From a paper:
Here we report the identification, purification and characterization of a novel anticoagulant ringhalexin (Ringhals extrinsic tenase complex inhibitor) from the venom of H. haemachatus. Ringhalexin exhibited a mixed-type inhibition to FX activation by the extrinsic tenase complex and also exhibited a weak, irreversible, neurotoxicity on chick biventer cervicis muscle (CBCM) preparations. Ringhalexin, like other 3FTxs, has three β-stranded loops extending from a central core containing four conserved disulfide bonds which resembles the three outstretched fingers of a hand. Thus, ringhalexin exhibits mixed-type inhibition of FX activation by extrinsic tenase complex.
There were three protein molecules in an asymmetric unit with each molecule consisting of residues from Arg1 to Ala65. All the three monomers are well defined in the electron density map. The model was refined to a final R value of 0.22 (Rfree = 0.27). Each monomer of the asymmetric unit consists of 6 anti-parallel β-strands (β2↓β1↑β4↓β3↑β6↓β5↑) that form two β-sheets. The first β-sheet consists of two anti-parallel β-strands, β1 (Leu2-Tyr7) and β2 (Ser11-Ile16), while the second contains four anti-parallel strands, β3 (Tyr23-Pro29), β4 (Ile39-Ala43), β5 (Cys46-Ala51) and β6 (Val53-Cys58). The fold of ringhalexin is maintained by four disulfide bonds, and these cysteines are strictly conserved among the 3FTxs. As shown in the case of other 3FTxs, the loop II of ringhalexin was very flexible and some of the residues showed very high B values. This flexibility suggests the possible role of loop II residues in the function of ringhalexin.
Numbering used by the authors:
A (entry chain A), B (entry chain A): 1 to 65
The structure:
């Protein structure tokens, strides 16, 4: 499985997932619009979210944008 | 298309991409901070990544920094 590490304009950073990891996730904060941190990577299971955080979880190549 | 071959301070090494190659890429390892190798060049398609490697893939002149 291939996930994105970063995504912008069209600049995407691509990684190949470890064995058994077939999910791509994206983590971002809930009340931030003024240039928020965003976290991406591979996962064996959809990451559980934290207090003020959403996690996108998807299962296709380079899906977490 | 023009891609970077090397980039630093402000010293950039510039190349002109072959016909049909309109992507610039950048390849770098995943757990290395202590002066890592970095690979840059032109591409017809975004290079697939390797085990412990990220590949940036972008589509503008001299975009892979």
């Amino acid at each position: 499985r291939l996930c994105l590490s970063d995504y912008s304009i069209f600049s995407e950073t691509i990684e190949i997932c470890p064995e058994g990891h077939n999910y791509c996730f994206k983590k971002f904060p809930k009340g931030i619009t003024r240039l928020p941190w965003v976290i991406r990577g591979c996962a064996a299971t959809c990451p559980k979210p934290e207090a003020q955080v959403y996690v996108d979880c998807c299962a296709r190549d380079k899906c977490n944008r």
